[PDB]
Amino acid sequence: MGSHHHHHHHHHHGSCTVSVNGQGSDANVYLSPVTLTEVKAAAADTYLKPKSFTIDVSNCQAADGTKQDDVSKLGVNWTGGNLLAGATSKQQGYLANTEASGAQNIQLVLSTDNATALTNKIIPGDSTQPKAKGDASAVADGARFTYYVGYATSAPTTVTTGVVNSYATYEITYQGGGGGGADTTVGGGQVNFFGKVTDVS
Secondary structure (H helix, E strand, O other): OOOOOOOOOOOOEEEEEEEEOOOOOEEEEEOOOEOOOHHHHOOOOOOOOOEEEEEEEEEEEEOOOOEOOOOOOOEEEEEEEOEOOOOOHHHOOEEOOOOOOOOOOOEEEEEOOOOOOOOOEOOOOOOOOOOEEOEOOOOOOOEEEEEEEEEEOOOHHHOOOOEEEEEEEEEEEOOOOOOOOOOOOOEEEEEEEEEEEOOOO
């Protein structure tokens, strides 16, 4: 209780390394598939077989090139991506297709747990977004963050087949819930997704 109202300085940060799933700070990654029936038989906006992902972040330093100790204050924030046009509250957090010949009502999602509980889905523009939470042991002097992907759609009764390819964009931030309160951009990175249906026509 008390302290930290005068005689303090909390951050000075300039840059970091980020690495997605065994790539660099820019990453392509193949998505988890569905069967011809599993896509139409999945329920509207429900959970299914995700894919599990990690961001390694290192060399976290000042504008002066000096590397630091802030390994509990750090966390990922999602800035944007190829998001769903005309989305409603249930459909918020959804990634649309770049394939013109691909699937229509089928999207990707961002979430914290995903495998039985996808309903904790994440939106880039929303202040309710949780930051991903770093493991200081999993990197030499920085920390490692965790996230997931799965499907969603409003209408399985209107679902199409093919491919669905997309992307999301991120930044690294300081102490506070996502971008909430005072902040500084510690780093950032870029991840591209590549999904499809099995045995396609």
